[PDB]
């Protein structure tokens, strides 16, 4: 084929691979920050559910 | 049959009846035990298994026709009769192959008994096969290491099987046996010496018969006595059933035994124990060549039913 | 690139579903057709590489090697027809499939765009090779040879895997194009030094560096003919290709870290050529000659000049062809006398005349006779090293002299003198062996008319 | 030590059964056809046609294009007085040197 | 554990060679005691005196290796005036390997131990200088 | 923590050390197992009672149940060893090596 | 041919029919699921 | 018989069909890389009449 | 454990309802074809082990192998695509909601940046 | 043993593991462990031999000690936190005790000593269960508490496990002991990535389970327990020994086989956390495992050993027992590398 076909295919491939590399670095930074802070949807280790607490009159008045 | 059948309710103790017994008719070479065994089978109604030879396994597997010696057995009884001290190890190889054949025969017999319920009348047994080996060792045909290998193989296979309820032994003396052999016609049998038969009789009367009498009853008959089938049958019909460990068997051990005897490769698992005796150790090149020859036999390439050469069809949907 | 990969895969069902009288014929036909098709890959652009897709690409470095592999597969089949004639049909099919898998893996190594895919396939090439060496070898040393080879390669390559994953994590990508454009200088810290080593030692083991070369003689001697053919023609050039590909991200630390390897190779060439001067096994002599020849490629890659890279590519192609042909000739001699002792059979110039001419031409190519591509590569590397340092010329000239000496010594010992009296099984050479030698030689001589094809991407 | 087959005699010369052998297999017909296949697809196709294909391969290395561009550039430089080849691969006006 | 590690590392390179050697000796002695305990547990000595002798031999070997390594490294740092060069630790490790060979009375063991130990000590020094983490905290 | 907690933890530690250090009999090892179970029962019971974790007062009973289940397991294994070797000596368990 | 009839023997038409029916049912369910997924994906986006 | 020939040498068609399929797959892969078809400053030119794509 | 603790994640659910907003994997997917190839290889090995004609015996069994492998592979690929889409969505949302941690860098062209030249002599 | 009783015991083992993997209460996890041990001992002793009794006794002693330590850790965590939920353990001493107990249950070195002995004592049927199913519950517990695990202790245990597994596998000629040491090495590989990424631990566990299922089922199909006995299998059934060679190569971690997936992903995750020395050492030490696998491959298929004459009779008969999962387990353990991006489904 023409020399321009390989040129444009190479440009598309380079764009895709550069986007992949940037996304990989972004993902690594995001994962590190989420693990360090725990303020995102990832690394949300479970805690005690507050629906188990019994909010009813107990025996002793001081609860 | 499997664990599912045992769970669902199929129990062998239901099938066992008065005549659900395994009978082994023993005797020295050409003692006429075969006719006695056949007559016992005819009158008691039990199934008769002719003594296992070199090509017994060929009868049960495939067309029922013997294969070539190179493929099935790699041993010759005639060669042993001609040259019992051969350097090819034909003597001990034949003895081990015969022990394996009788082990398979005993498994088939027990299977038949535990499935159909009909009794079995075998000629000799794995329990009686050691007599020939001991005679060979005493004559000097085989060395001590062969006997050790035979004992090692036997102690791992025979323990998983129940000894026969009745042991019928014919006691034709050595000179009469020699006369019969010299009148039988077979020159190879005529080549048999006297000390060989004498040692066979010695082993039979010193180890087999006493040990079998320790377990169960052991009926004994001479040449004249064994010729009355009715007399022998009547003795079996009135033997004390307490003899033998079979009354000590429940459906659990029966299930174990029936599972074992249905898997022939499991039966023969310890026959090929990796003991590198020069008498039985087949080399890699010969093993490959003989296995390739066996695989090229009609019907022996694929599993039974998938060999298109022998008329098996529907393989695409089978 | 799938135009070559798909037929290579389809070779397997073809051989498996072919009659027992037609495995070799069909394999040869379609391997030759695959090579003919792969010849189209030589139309490389001047500057940009041929980027077929996201996964596969080819430049003026990958294409010659791909053509060499696709051309060498039929040659391996023809050479291995002889001894694998009494084998069963299933094992013959298995051997053919091992060869096909090796060729497929080599193609996908030479075309891979991702360094980690390249690593995966270039380590996947071990399994078919090892099996071939340890299953169809003739001697009892084939078991130790397979272990040495496998463990040398793995101990070299595992740190390469670690380094590649680290680079992927740090730079974000392992694609060759991106890693070439987004290239950055390496500092002189110890961490960069050890990353450089991890990236380099893996390929230094493959193309045997002097000291790490002990596996090559065992592997080439104990393996069957076809196995030795691949090991000498392509499996050694794998390391050179990998080094030429990865040296992009290893600068400028190479300038200072290449000295140990440069000295090791420039002395090991002389040492291994001298070893060839005093060898008693033909295959061992050829293997040590291969070590000596690959030392020059190691030097050329470690110098990183355009002439050095051109010479490295030319020498890789030329040496692959020459070593494969030499191993084939030694295989013919072995199949005739059933022994690899060089001094056993003598005076073969009087019993096999055409085989003597094949030996002569192969030895002339081995000793870099002008205008063969062997000499083109050697002279380019010599000029590059002389520009690097004038002192290098002494070692280069000594190596050339010893190479000529041992090549002509092999020619004299084997194809000259008085015939061995007791040997009577030397039959006239078959058409197959002569055709194998002709197919080894004719492309080699024709490449001298168009050397630009195998001069690499820096031409 | 073992019951093993004796070492097979050294490979029987294929010339014995058929003096015309070409090596390869044992059947004469398959020998002839294997030799024909090898010679044809090796020399007449992938060697001859291969070398012709690689000899007339279109100039995608742009060697003639580079030579023509060099000729045009040399004409321009010498005719207009320019000093042939400059001393900077890039224009200094676009370099923000520290 | 980390107490001894910081008793050895806090001492600056090429300073207080006696105290550095003492800290290295203590670390070696602790390692030798651990090895002796494991050897006694897995390979029981016949007698209590035999166990004491085995423990003493192992502890003395390990402590001597540590002391020689520390002394050699500190002396090299002092004389060469290069505290941050891994060659000092390489020399110390090779000296420790030579002492190990001397205790085992084997030249081959001595040479192999010198080589491997020197390489490992140089690697440890490089990791300290660069910041290599043998046990990396989970960071992702 | 109160000193009773220290004493109970020390008792558990002593029982663990005893179990880990066999002398001859397998019976004494089972004794050390039962002692550890008893110590854990006492610890858990004190913790539950002190913190008035009413719904968790059934935990020590379950612990005791599985404790004597393990004790029965040990006793059955002990009888099998004695039947197979004549003594419950821990040295008879030697066939399986490495 | 064989003295003992093969354990497989004539095809177990019950088992063969069950296998064929299961395979056909799996293919039909897969095709229907793919069609439903394509339709739902188009619906949720446009 | 002709049917004998095909039933004995049907394998001589796999690898050619394989090459055809590989060429088709390469074309399909090239289809999914038309992100810069005519948008490169070097080969960007106006499409000639009756030419929807430059196939690049 | 990353995605295990995501809010709203229903336990023991192979495909959440939100996954339907993603395009289903095509039935001509190369991964699905490879799953079918694995099923066919499993059938061939099953034939080989039971000592029956490898390429012809039991066409129904090989067909069942291929169908089951393709079915499970399709569902597995759908779940994998959903999980990767979830990862990308969460990463993008976290980047958007934390501008300080991911600031735009000054874009200096190579004409401005000074990268040291290391000669090769 | 009655088949109904054996099925009940197997279901009790499985129910104990499911209780461990399903509950949210520490007491129920300990209960599941106890049920697993109770129903595992008779399964170990299904075939009554002195070696089987010895294996059962050793396994019972080790698991009992581990369960006692685990319950002590649970009690201490309750004392210092008043919590029973499986969450971030609030006491370092309790965390250390629980880690030791769980490593002893898994067989991580230096708690590895019982694995080669118990594995050799029991049959292949019981060995498969011991080396595959008995690893699920402790690994699940470790994955639930990976946040509180001290990384240093777990990494030291993993590295020691890999080293000791490789070293032990080299001197072994019994196949069961080789499998046990390989299991120890693979458990070390799995536990190396626990503090970093548990999904990689799950992936490694799945791959190892498939490989070990394939290997044990091939051994059962060959009825071989020693290298010499397995060598004879080339004559009767070359397919089995060829598949065994392929599976051994996969277990070695050689690409493109499936065994490369877990090591590759583990090295990736450990390099993402700036740990470069530990994964390199682990990869280098895997070469010992690769060595003994290769030695077995030589003795089994790559090279042919002398058979015996009696194999001629065995040639005539065909295997009756049919393991329906063996081809699938072989395929999944050899040819699944092109399918790594399926890792996300384990998230």
UniProtKB/Swiss-Prot annotation, chain C:
GO cellular component, one term: mitochondrial inner membrane
First-listed, main subcellular location of the protein, grouped into a coarse class: mitochondrion
Pfam families: Oxidored_q5_N, Proton_antipo_M
Listed GO biological process terms: aerobic respiration; electron transport coupled proton transport; mitochondrial electron transport, NADH to ubiquinone; mitochondrial respiratory chain complex I assembly
Keywords noted in UniProt: Electron transport, Membrane, Mitochondrion, Mitochondrion inner membrane, NAD, Respiratory chain, Translocase, Transmembrane, Transmembrane helix, Transport, Ubiquinone
Coiled-coil region list: none
GO molecular function, one term: ubiquinone binding
Residue intervals passing through the bilayer: 22-42, 60-80, 98-118, 147-167, 193-213, 224-244, 257-277, 284-303, 308-330, 351-371, 391-413, 435-455
Enzyme class, first EC level, given as a word: translocase
Catalytically driven reaction(s): a ubiquinone + NADH + 5 H(+)(in) = a ubiquinol + NAD(+) + 4 H(+)(out)
Membrane topology: Multi-pass membrane protein
Domain of life the protein comes from: Eukaryota
Documented EC number(s): 7.1.1.2
Protein location: Mitochondrion inner membrane
Family label: Belongs to the complex I subunit 4 family.
PANTHER family: NADH-UBIQUINONE OXIDOREDUCTASE CHAIN 4
Subunit annotation: Core subunit of respiratory chain NADH dehydrogenase (Complex I) which is composed of 45 different subunits.
Entry function: Core subunit of the mitochondrial membrane respiratory chain NADH dehydrogenase (Complex I) which catalyzes electron transfer from NADH through the respiratory chain, using ubiquinone as an electron acceptor. Essential for the catalytic activity and assembly of complex I.
Name by which UniProt lists this protein: NADH-ubiquinone oxidoreductase chain 4
GN (gene name): MT-ND4
From Swiss-Prot, chain F:
Keyword check for NAD: yes
TM annotation in the entry: 1-21, 29-49, 61-81
GO BP: ATP synthesis coupled electron transport
EC number in record: 7.1.1.2
Residue ranges of coiled coil: none
Record GO terms (molecular function): NADH dehydrogenase (ubiquinone) activity
GO cellular component terms, A-Z: mitochondrial inner membrane; respiratory chain complex I
Catalytic function, reaction form: a ubiquinone + NADH + 5 H(+)(in) = a ubiquinol + NAD(+) + 4 H(+)(out)
UniProt KW keywords: Electron transport, Membrane, Mitochondrion, Mitochondrion inner membrane, NAD, Respiratory chain, Translocase, Transmembrane, Transmembrane helix, Transport, Ubiquinone
Keyword flag Mitochondrion: yes
InterPro entries (UniProt xref): NADH_UbQ_OxRdtase_chain4L/K, NUOK/Mnh_C1-like
Major location (coarse): mitochondrion
Enzyme class per UniProt: translocase
Protein's membrane topology: Multi-pass membrane protein
Subcellular location: Mitochondrion inner membrane
Family: Belongs to the complex I subunit 4L family.
Function: Core subunit of the mitochondrial membrane respiratory chain NADH dehydrogenase (Complex I) which catalyzes electron transfer from NADH through the respiratory chain, using ubiquinone as an electron acceptor. Part of the enzyme membrane arm which is embedded in the lipid bilayer and involved in proton translocation.
Subunit structure and binding partners: Core subunit of respiratory chain NADH dehydrogenase (Complex I) which is composed of 45 different subunits.
UniProt name for this protein: NADH-ubiquinone oxidoreductase chain 4L
Chain's gene name: MT-ND4L
Curated annotation (Swiss-Prot), chain J:
The keyword Electron transport appears for this protein: yes
Entries under InterPro entries matching the protein: Complex_I_Subunit_2, NADH_DH_su2_C, NADH_UbQ_OxRdtase_chain2, ND/Mrp_TM
Reaction(s) this enzyme catalyzes, per UniProt: a ubiquinone + NADH + 5 H(+)(in) = a ubiquinol + NAD(+) + 4 H(+)(out)
Membrane topology value: Multi-pass membrane protein
Spans traversing the lipid bilayer: 3-23, 25-45, 59-79, 89-109, 149-169, 178-198, 200-220, 237-257, 274-294, 325-345
Top-level enzyme category: translocase
Family of the protein in this entry: Belongs to the complex I subunit 2 family.
Function summary: Core subunit of the mitochondrial membrane respiratory chain NADH dehydrogenase (Complex I) which catalyzes electron transfer from NADH through the respiratory chain, using ubiquinone as an electron acceptor. Essential for the catalytic activity and assembly of complex I.
Protein's UniProt name: NADH-ubiquinone oxidoreductase chain 2
Species: Sus scrofa (Pig)
């Amino acid at each position: 084929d023409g020399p321009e076909k390989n040129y444009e295919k190479t440009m598309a491939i380079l764009q895709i691979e550069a986007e992949k590399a940037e996304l990989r670095l972004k993902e690594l930074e995001v994962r590190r920050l989420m693990r360090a802070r725990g303020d995102g949807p990832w690394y949300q280790y479970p805690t005690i559910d507050k629906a188990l607490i019994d909010h009813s009159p107990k025996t002793t008045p001081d609860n | 049959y499997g664990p599912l059948a045992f769970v669902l309710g199929e129990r062998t103790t239901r099938k066992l009846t008065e005549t659900s017994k395994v009978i082994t008719v023993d005797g020295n070479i050409c003692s006429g035990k075969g006719r006695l065994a056949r007559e016992i089978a005819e009158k008691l109604g039990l199934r008769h298994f002719p003594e296992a030879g070199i090509h017994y396994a060929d009868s049960t597997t495939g067309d029922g026709k013997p294969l070539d010696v190179q493929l099935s057995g790699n041993c010759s009884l005639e060669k042993f009769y001609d040259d019992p001290k051969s350097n090819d190890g034909n003597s001990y190889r034949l003895q081990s192959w015969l022990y394996a054949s009788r082990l398979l025969q005993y498994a088939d017999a027990l299977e038949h008994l535990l499935s159909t319920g009909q009794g079995v009348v075998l000629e000799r047994s794995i329990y009686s096969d050691f007599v020939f080996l001991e005679a060979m060792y005493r004559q000097g045909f085989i060395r001590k290491q062969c006997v050790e290998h035979y004992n090692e193989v036997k102690k791992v296979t025979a323990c998983e099987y129940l000894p026969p309820h009745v042991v019928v032994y014919v006691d034709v003396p050595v000179p009469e046996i020699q006369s019969r052999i010299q009148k039988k016609g077979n020159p190879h049998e005529m080549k048999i010496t006297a000390a060989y038969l004498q040692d066979i009789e010695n082993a039979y009367k010193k180890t087999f018969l006493p040990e079998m009498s320790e377990k169960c009853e052991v009926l004994q008959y001479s040449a004249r006595e064994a010729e009355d089938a009715e007399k022998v049958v009547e003795d079996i019909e009135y033997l004390k059933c307490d003899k033998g460990p079979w009354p000590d068997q429940d459906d659990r051990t029966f299930h174990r035994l029936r599972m074992l005897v249905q898997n022939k490769l499991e039966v023969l698992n310890y026959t090929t124990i990796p003991v590198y005796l020069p008498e039985i150790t087949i080399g890699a090149h010969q093993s490959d060549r003989v296995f390739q020859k066996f695989t090229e036999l009609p019907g022996r390439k694929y599993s039974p039913g998938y060999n298109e050469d022998v008329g098996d069809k529907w393989i695409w949907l089978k | 690139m799938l135009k070559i990969i798909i037929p290579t895969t389809m070779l397997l069902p073809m051989t498996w579903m072919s009659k027992h009288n037609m495995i070799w014929i069909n394999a040869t036909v379609h391997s030759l057709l695959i090579s003919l098709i792969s010849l189209s890959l030589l139309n490389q652009l001047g500057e940009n590489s041929l980027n077929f897709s996201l996964t596969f690409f080819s430049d003026s470095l990958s294409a010659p090697l791909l053509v060499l592999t696709t051309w060498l597969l039929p040659l391996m089949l023809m050479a291995s027809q002889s001894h694998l004639s009494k084998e069963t049909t299933t094992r013959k099919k298995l051997y053919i499939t091992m060869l096909i898998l090796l060729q497929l893996f080599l193609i996908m190594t030479f075309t891979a765009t991702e360094l980690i895919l390249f690593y995966i396939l270039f380590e996947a090439t071990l399994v078919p090779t090892l099996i071939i060496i340890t299953r169809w070898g003739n001697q009892t040393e084939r078991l130790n040879a397979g272990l040495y080879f496998l463990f040398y390669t793995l101990a070299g390559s595992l740190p390469l895997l670690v380094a590649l994953v680290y680079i992927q994590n740090t730079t974000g990508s392992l694609n060759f194009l991106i890693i070439h454009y987004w290239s950055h200088p390496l500092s002189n810290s110890w961490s960069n030094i050890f990353m450089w080593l991890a990236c380099i030692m893996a390929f230094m083991v493959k193309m045997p560096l002097y000291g790490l070369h002990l596996w090559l003689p065992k592997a080439h001697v104990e393996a069957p003919i076809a196995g030795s053919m691949v090991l000498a023609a392509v499996l050694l050039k794998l390391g050179g290709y990998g080094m030429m590909r990865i040296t992009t991200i290893l600068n400028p630390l190479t300038n200072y870290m290449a000295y140990p390897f440069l000295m090791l190779s420039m002395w090991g060439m002389i040492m291994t050529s001298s070893i060839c001067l005093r060898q008693t096994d033909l295959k061992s002599l050829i293997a040590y000659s291969s070590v000596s020849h690959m030392a020059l490629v190691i030097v050329a890659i470690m110098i990183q000049t355009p002439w050095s890279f051109m010479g490295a590519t030319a020498l890789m192609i030329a040496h692959g062809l020459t070593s494969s042909m030499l191993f084939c000739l030694a295989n013919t001699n072995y199949e005739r006398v059933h022994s690899r002792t060089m001094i056993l059979a003598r005076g073969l110039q009087t019993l096999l005349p055409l085989m003597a001419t094949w030996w002569l031409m192969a030895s002339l190519t081995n000793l870099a006779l002008p205008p063969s591509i062997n000499l083109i590569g050697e002279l380019f590397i010599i000029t590059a090293s002389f520009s690097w340092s004038n002192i290098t010329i002494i070692l280069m000239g000594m190596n050339m002299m010893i190479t000529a000496l041992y090549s002509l010594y092999m020619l004299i010992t084997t194809q000259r003198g008085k015939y061995t009296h007791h040997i009577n099984n030397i039959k006239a050479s078959f058409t197959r062996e002569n055709a194998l030698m002709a197919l080894h030689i004719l492309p080699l001589l024709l490449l001298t008319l168009n050397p630009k094809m195998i001069l690499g991407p820096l031409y | 030590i073992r019951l093993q087959e004796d070492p097979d005699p050294e490979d029987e010369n294929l010339y014995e059964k058929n003096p015309d052998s070409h090596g390869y297999d044992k059947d004469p017909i398959v020998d002839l056809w294997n030799m024909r296949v090898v010679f044809f697809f090796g020399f007449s196709i992938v060697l001859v046609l291969g070398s012709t294909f690689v000899a007339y391969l279109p100039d995608y290395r742009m060697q003639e294009w580079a030579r023509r561009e060099a000729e045009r550039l040399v004409k321009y430089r010498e005719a207009n007085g320019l000093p042939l080849m400059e001393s900077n691969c890039f224009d200094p006006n676009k370099i923000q040197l520290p | 554990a980390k107490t001894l590690l910081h008793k050895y590392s806090d001492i600056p390179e090429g300073t207080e060679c006696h105290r550095k050697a003492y800290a290295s000796t203590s670390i070696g002695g602790a390692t030798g005691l651990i090895v002796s305990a494991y050897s006694i547990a897995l390979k029981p000595p016949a007698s209590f005196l035999e166990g004491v002798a085995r423990t003493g031999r192992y502890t003395f070997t390990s402590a001597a290796i540590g002391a020689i390594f520390g002394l050699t490294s500190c002396i090299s740092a002092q004389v060469r005036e290069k505290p941050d060069d891994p060659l000092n630790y390489f020399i110390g490790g090779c000296a420790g390997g030579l002492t190990l060979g001397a205790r085992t009375r084997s030249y081959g063991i001595g040479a192999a131990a010198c080589a491997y130990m020197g390489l490992t000590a140089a690697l440890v020094k490089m990791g300290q200088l660069e910041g290599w983490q043998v046990f990396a905290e989970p960071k992702v | 923590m109160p000193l009773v907690y220290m004493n109970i933890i020390m008792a558990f530690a002593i029982a663990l050390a005893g179990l880990l250090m066999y002398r001859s009999h397998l019976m004494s090892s089972l004794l050390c197992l039962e002692g550890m179970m008893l110590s854990l029962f006492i610890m858990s019971t004190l913790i539950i009672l002190n913190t008035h974790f009413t719904l968790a007062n059934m935990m020590p009973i379950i612990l005791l149940v599985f404790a004597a289940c393990e004790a029965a397991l040990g006793l059955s294994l002990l009888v099998m060893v004695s039947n197979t070797y004549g003594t419950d000596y821990v040295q008879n368990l030697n066939l399986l090596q490495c | 041919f064989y003295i003992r009839e093969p354990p497989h023997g004539s095809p177990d038409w019950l088992k063969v029919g069950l296998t064929l029916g299961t395979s056909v049912f799996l293919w039909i369910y897969l095709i229907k699921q793919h069609k439903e997924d394509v339709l739902e994906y188009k619906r949720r986006n446009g | 018989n002709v049917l004998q020939i095909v039933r004995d040498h049907w394998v001589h068609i796999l690898v050619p069909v394989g090459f055809v399929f590989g060429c088709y797959l390469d074309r399909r892969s090239d289809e999914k890389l038309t992100a810069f078809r005519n948008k490169s400053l070097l080969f960007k030119r106006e499409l000639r009449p009756n030419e929807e794509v430059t196939w690049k | 454990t990353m995605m295990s603790g995501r809010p709203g994640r229903v336990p023991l659910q192979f495909l959440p309802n939100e996954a339907r907003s993603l395009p289903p994997p095509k039935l001509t997917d190369p991964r699905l074809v490879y799953m079918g190839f694995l099923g066919y290889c499993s059938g061939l090995i099953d034939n080989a082990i039971r000592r029956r004609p490898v390429v012809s015996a039991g066409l129904h069994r090989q067909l069942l192998y291929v169908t089951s492998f393709v079915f499970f592979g399709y569902y597995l690929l759908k779940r994998q695509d959903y999980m990767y889409a979830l990862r990308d969505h969460d990463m993008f949302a976290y980047v958007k909601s934390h501008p300080e941690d991911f600031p735009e860098k000054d874009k200096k062209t190579y004409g401005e940046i000074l990268e040291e030249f290391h000669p090769v002599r | 043993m009655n088949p109904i009783i054996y099925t009940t015991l197997i279901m009790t083992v499985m129910s104990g593991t499911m209780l461990v993997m399903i509950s949210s209460h520490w007491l129920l996890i300990w209960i599941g462990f106890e049920m697993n041990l109770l129903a595992m001992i008779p399964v170990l002793m299904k075939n009554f031999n002195p070696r089987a009794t010895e294996a059962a006794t050793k396994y019972f002693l080790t698991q009992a000690t581990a369960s006692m330590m685990l319950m002590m850790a649970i009690i201490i965590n309750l004392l210092y936190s008043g919590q029973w939920t499986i969450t971030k353990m609030f006491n370092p001493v309790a965390m250390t005790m629980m880690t030791m107990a769980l490593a002893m249950k898994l067989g991580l070195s230096p708690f590895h000593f019982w694995v080669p002995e118990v594995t050799q004592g029991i049959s292949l049927q019981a060995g498969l269960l011991l080396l595959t199913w008995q690893k699920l519950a402790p690994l699940s517990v470790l994955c639930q508490i990976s946040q509180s695990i001290n990384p240093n202790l777990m990494l030291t245990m993993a590295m020691l496990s890999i080293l000791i597994g490789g070293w032990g596998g080299l001197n072994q000629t019994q196949l069961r002991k080789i499998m046990a040491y390989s299991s120890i090495a693979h458990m070390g590989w799995m536990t190396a990535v626990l503090p970093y990424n548990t999904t990689m631990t799950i992936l490694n566990l799945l791959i190892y389970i498939t490989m070990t299922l394939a290997m044990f089922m091939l051994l059962i199909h060959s009825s071989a327990t020693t290298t010499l006995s397995l060598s004879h299998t080339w004559n009767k059934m070359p397919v089995i020994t060829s598949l065994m060679m392929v599976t051994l190569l996969s277990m070695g971690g050689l690409p493109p086989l499936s065994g490369f997936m877990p090591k590759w992903m583990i090295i990736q995750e450990m390099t993402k956390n700036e740990s470069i020395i530990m994964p390199t050492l682990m990869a280098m030490t895997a070469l010992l495992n690769l060595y003994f696998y290769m030695r077995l491959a030589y003795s089994s298929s790559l090279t042919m050993f002398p058979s015996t004459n009696n194999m001629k009779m065995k040639w005539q008969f065909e295997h009756t027992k049919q393991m329906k999962l063996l081809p699938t387990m072989i395929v999944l353990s050899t040819l699944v590398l092109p399918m790594t991006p399926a890792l996300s489904s384990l998230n």
